[PDB]
Ligand binder design. Structure first.
Ligand SMILES: NC(=O)c1ccc[n+]([C@@H]2O[C@H](COP(=O)([O-])OP(=O)(O)OC[C@H]3O[C@@H](n4cnc5c(N)ncnc54)[C@H](O)[C@@H]3O)[C@@H](O)[C@H]2O)c1
Ligand SMILES: NC(=O)c1ccc[n+]([C@@H]2O[C@H](COP(=O)([O-])OP(=O)(O)OC[C@H]3O[C@@H](n4cnc5c(N)ncnc54)[C@H](O)[C@@H]3O)[C@@H](O)[C@H]2O)c1
Ligand SMILES: NC(=O)c1ccc[n+]([C@@H]2O[C@H](COP(=O)([O-])OP(=O)(O)OC[C@H]3O[C@@H](n4cnc5c(N)ncnc54)[C@H](O)[C@@H]3O)[C@@H](O)[C@H]2O)c1
Ligand SMILES: NC(=O)c1ccc[n+]([C@@H]2O[C@H](COP(=O)([O-])OP(=O)(O)OC[C@H]3O[C@@H](n4cnc5c(N)ncnc54)[C@H](O)[C@@H]3O)[C@@H](O)[C@H]2O)c1
Ligand SMILES: CNC(=O)CN(Cc1ccc(F)cc1)C(=O)C[C@H]1CC[C@@H](NC(=O)c2nnn(Cc3ccccc3)c2C)CC1
Ligand SMILES: CNC(=O)CN(Cc1ccc(F)cc1)C(=O)C[C@H]1CC[C@@H](NC(=O)c2nnn(Cc3ccccc3)c2C)CC1
Ligand SMILES: CNC(=O)CN(Cc1ccc(F)cc1)C(=O)C[C@H]1CC[C@@H](NC(=O)c2nnn(Cc3ccccc3)c2C)CC1
Ligand SMILES: CNC(=O)CN(Cc1ccc(F)cc1)C(=O)C[C@H]1CC[C@@H](NC(=O)c2nnn(Cc3ccccc3)c2C)CC1
Lengths: 250, 255, 255, 260
């Protein structure tokens, strides 16, 4: 009697048990989903983190910058879920921006090689993952990616804010492609999660229902709502799981 | 069910084509216990609500009537039982006289009545019902994206722009009770409501299904009803003062 | 001069701190010939650098609106038309803006506020478009209402309605080859509400200058008057139904 | 003139149909003293800049070339004279290979092509501001060209993504430019006929996208004419929008404000 009973869902982005993807995976399993997980570089380490989830799930390697990993992804997922079975959901919870482009480094001092790598991993890969997986997705399916509202500039986030602005645009185009398969594509724009202090503290102040940066469960639940059959007419869009902070000036 | 055990008030049923009728039907299929509110044609509304899968008390509510608003919480408490509170409230009410739906020829008395019913009443209903809502509760109102002007919708577009602003303020008040307030912006639905405006609205409708990456079926209110039920559930707990678009993704595409 | 030879109507002067006073002053410095409307004001308008006829205009008065074009034609001379119109009018009773809880504003007060602050932008365009030249410009004053905030309450709702009205006025004005736009200004200084509200409104103001990349001086209306004159000029000829922000860039920054 | 005595750098001229050519022409008609920058085909660009109403020095600038960016301020100072600074900077540069914009499926654009397009179309707005802010006067203005990317559309594909990135870059450039008392803004223009080549199907789709624009625009939209766009850029370069920064001004006939 779970929200995602019987659904086959791929979840990328687990690195620690504080990863937003770890909480998404935990809630999806509690709700009856059968998962396939993807990890980057430190696969033995990631496998040990995935052992903390309530149910066993196969772990596949996926470096989104690696064309060979993307070319073989659908075949490897099909081995994991069984021939004749397809995915009902895909979760993109991947991001990266070198220290030259996010933090205390001046915005103007980020070399383009660093910005390009960050945009490749954080934005272009949302299209790459949809390209690889839409041929193995069922109608009524759902692709969800993680976002941080980039509509206004802010301290420190710098080039990662630019990568999120690009990701929002990529999501609208992925929705055009996914619609051909009867699949939805949406982003969840979350408030800050402890996975800068003054900026982050502003969310709880503005949020009419408050914001707890130490609690990823409300974000995971929102992703699961989009993976469910309960938002069937929403695509190319952004759902804000931020306590309502973006709707208030002060 | 998605809403098992939840006590939810649903306003705005007039016909079985009303978006509120479909919201009520889906909510009951999902285990919710409803309280319904109707305006003016109560005997007629009772014949329509007899078509729902489960019985529900029907209370009169004219949002322009201060006495109805002053007594609403007490009448709802009588219907659900002393000691019980609401978990959800659905505002599915709108009105704009014909004059407001040429743009310049709408008299202010007509525009004011339309804004009272379509936008101010969202605050009126929250004021009356928040004192009888449980923490984790949810208030949901119906919207039609008014970010851009369009043919014929005219002053009702202005009322929706005011409603979006009212929703952001209601969220500030509702938060004090641990309650969320959000709007669902739906695509056009064939509910009961000249040649020029007729042709323009036909073009607006056709364009909607063309732009929507997953298409849009104006004869099917179920996807909209499901979206309202998602907001009434425990599955969007960090969303408030916001707008969820149940429009096939049409607003995200230019062509 | 930026506005050399242009005939421009300017509403909204009540004191020499009114944003409309600064708009009128800058427009005259830039060579415009003005017609002023107000609703005692002659002593204030005598402080402008040049003489200008002052006509009475209560935007809630249907007779004033019906006779406005004829009265303006008498003032500027038969055979002459207006090139610009400035709406710098706003009103909200203390029940709807200030310290009063959002839920305690009666609709009669909110409706009067929306009539004067939003509907009148359409009323003024209806009255004046028949006497405007092609290439003309209508400009109204706005305060960004995209997010809720303390104290502004129902005046925020009136601005949300005004932004929607501006998009529809642009549709009508386009038929005459006239543009319609709003200038969304930062706060301008045009303990009276208590210690608590005073501190909250002070924080709202300090944050504005903090967020604005070029800063924001609440005591200086000249950057706002210059922005309105840019829209009245021939230099933004392809902008209509839109909003230009003269707020130091504060709305583009989170912190 | 609106820009009398102002020293303004204008990048992006390649043909006399370039939006930058019209921005330069209007700026000179309004009394500005220009410095022009061009990419790769400098001899060809000089023949085009001879068509402007006044002479202006032409400097080479490939925005992907770190050496050109490192020497730019010094070369501009030589052109305008020691002790003089710029009052304006216009970025009117964009590029996206055919794999990322046109008829090619959105999913078939390789990242090397997308990355080159984002480097030239978005990151270079920050590169140019970094190089030129040290030689800009207080009250100065940086303006870049945009095409509203808030909604997806046919064919524009990854160039839409590059514009979404550019809008975000503009908000961060405004934070840096403010330290110098300089504004940074974008002008989002409607479609302009700059330089059946893409086939019947795509041709009809792009034609519908264009016609819809003049239909939506309450004052209409003339796709042949960059002058209303050039005038809008000059308004931002002037002293008449002194409190606008990190922002976007739409010179699109009001099309983006109307659904139909
Ligand atoms: N932490 C927050 O405050 C916050 C708020 C809103 C949105 N988000 C977003 O949520 C997502 C997850 O971030 P997180 O906070 O959980 O941090 P995280 O560090 O736990 O997760 C980021 C993941 O990206 C993966 N990744 C990096 N390079 C990759 C590559 N080449 N191929 C594949 N995967 C790669 C990492 O291995 C890691 O699992 C990101 O998109 C982030 O931007 C985070
Ligand atoms: N039909 C669509 O295309 C569409 C699209 C998006 C949003 N909506 C919105 O959905 C909501 C419901 O509209 P609908 O299309 O189902 O039409 P409807 O006619 O079935 O419902 C409108 C309801 O408003 C009620 N109402 C009017 N005046 C009232 C008053 N004084 N007090 C109380 N109730 C009053 C009517 O009695 C009726 O039940 C409205 O907010 C509407 O704007 C409709
Ligand atoms: N911080 C601010 O002061 C600020 C910021 C942004 C925008 N604005 C807007 O600028 C405009 C002018 O406001 P202001 O700050 O100069 O204040 P103000 O009090 O000087 O101007 C308001 C004007 O509205 C007029 N008005 C009221 N009722 C009227 C009626 N029935 N008929 C005709 N005119 C009527 C008043 O006579 C007055 O001239 C308003 O739209 C306001 O919302 C103000
Ligand atoms: N044409 C339209 O419909 C339209 C609409 C809105 C915005 N815009 C924007 O206006 C700007 C100018 O485009 P246009 O339509 O005038 O086309 P264009 O081809 O005439 O201008 C593009 C310019 O970018 C230059 N450029 C490319 N690579 C470069 C590099 N490595 N270094 C330096 N410069 C480089 C080219 O040499 C050329 O001068 C672009 O930002 C474009 O996106 C165009
Ligand atoms: C070897 N070098 C890395 O491997 C670069 N590194 C490590 C690192 C980056 C920045 C930093 F300073 C410290 C450490 C990354 O690539 C980490 C990723 C993790 C996933 C993504 N993470 C977020 O998007 C995210 N992290 N924190 N926040 C909150 C926030 C809000 C506002 C301002 C600042 C922060 C967000 C929204 C993108 C960055
Ligand atoms: C007697 N006179 C009234 O009693 C006015 N009447 C009845 C009536 C209206 C129009 C009409 F011809 C005939 C009758 C109303 O006040 C009904 C309400 C019902 C609830 C609300 N309904 C919508 O908001 C709604 N109705 N249709 N659409 C689609 C659409 C989209 C864009 C443009 C046009 C249409 C919408 C979005 C607001 C109007
Ligand atoms: C003659 N009796 C009326 O006519 C009532 N009165 C006069 C009055 C009201 C309050 C007060 F104590 C003293 C005087 C009005 O109705 C004033 C109008 C003037 C024009 C409009 N004014 C603004 O829109 C405006 N005023 N202040 N701010 C800054 C701000 C920002 C955020 C929060 C709070 C403040 C704004 C944006 C709308 C209100
Ligand atoms: C003649 N030049 C280009 O072909 C040259 N190449 C390479 C190329 C060659 C052949 C080809 F076959 C496609 C692309 C460019 O990379 C030029 C740049 C110029 C600056 C930028 N240009 C625009 O941004 C721009 N160009 N057209 N439009 C209107 C529009 C709107 C919506 C959909 C489609 C079109 C826009 C908004 C981006 C492209």
């Amino acid at each position: 009697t779970g929200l995602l009973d019987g659904k086959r869902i791929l979840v990328s982005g687990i690195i620690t048990d504080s990863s937003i993807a770890f909480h998404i995976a935990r809630v999806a399993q509690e709700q009856g989903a059968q998962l396939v997980l993807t990890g980057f570089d430190r696969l033995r380490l990631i496998q040990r983190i995935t052992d903390r989830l309530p149910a066993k799930a196969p772990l596949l390697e996926l470096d989104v910058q690696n064309e060979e990993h993307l070319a073989s992804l659908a075949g490897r997922v099909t081995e994991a879920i069984g021939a004749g079975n397809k995915l009902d959901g895909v979760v993109h919870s991947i991001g990266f921006m070198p220290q030259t482009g996010m933090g205390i480094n001046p915005f103007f001092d980020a070399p383009y090689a660093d910005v390009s790598k960050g945009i490749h991993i954080s934005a272009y890969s949302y299209a790459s993952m949809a390209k690889a997986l839409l041929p193995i997705m069922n109608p009524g399916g759902s692709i969800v990616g993680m976002d941080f509202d980039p509509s206004r500039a802010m301290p420190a986030y710098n080039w990662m804010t630019v990568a999120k602005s690009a990701l929002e645009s990529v999501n609208r185009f992925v929705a055009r492609e996914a619609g051909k398969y009867g699949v939805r594509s949406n982003l969840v724009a979350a408030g800050p999660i402890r996975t800068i202090q003054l900026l982050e503290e502003g969310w709880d102040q503005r949020a009419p229902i408050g914001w707890n940066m130490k609690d990823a469960t409300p974000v995971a639940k929102t992703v699961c709502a989009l993976l469910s059959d309960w938002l069937p007419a929403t695509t190319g869009d952004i759902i804000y799981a931020d306590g309502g902070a973006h709707t208030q000036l002060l």
